[PDB]
């Protein structure tokens, strides 16, 4: 309970890393977009993935990742730009099979705004067939009835 506030904080502390990341790749796609100049990419995400894929792949952090809406930086990851374009392939990946692990339900989805972009991942012309069954094998159980 002081252990769990610690928890917390250190799920709350990736939340805002992964944000933070997520705004300096969009700053930097931005003007490689605006100048031209192909010598500029964007690698905040990139550097972040590893720590990312092993905090969300630990078991007892299950409830601390869901509780305090985690998922919800993993959403922003993931979501396609105005333009329909997506992260990399080696980002979807990662998160997928991440997510595959786990205990997600209809009401993490509502709160992080990850339902709706994984159906568009279900849907999307530009997603790699093994990565969209996946998201439409993950959206159906994530919303079961639950016997």
């Known amino acids: 309970d002081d252990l769990e506030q610690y928890l917390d904080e250190k799920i709350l502390r990736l939340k805002d890393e992964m944000n933070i990341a997520a705004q300096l790749d969009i700053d930097t796609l931005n003007k490689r977009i605006e100048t031209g100049d192909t010598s500029l990419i964007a690698m905040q995400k990139v550097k972040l993935l590893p720590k990312v894929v092993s905090v969300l792949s630990k078991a007892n952090l299950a409830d601390t990742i869901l509780d305090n809406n985690l998922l919800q930086s993993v959403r ?72």
């Open 76 to 147: 922003i990851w993931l979501e396609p730009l105005p333009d329909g374009s997506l992260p990399s392939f080696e980002i979807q990946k990662s998160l997928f099979a991440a997510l595959n692990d786990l205990p997600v339900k209809t009401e993490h989805l509502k709160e992080s705004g990850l339902g709706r972009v994984v159906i568009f991942y279900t849907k999307s012309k530009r997603v790699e067939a093994q990565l969209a069954r996946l998201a439409e094998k993950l959206i159906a159980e994530w919303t079961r009835p639950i016997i």
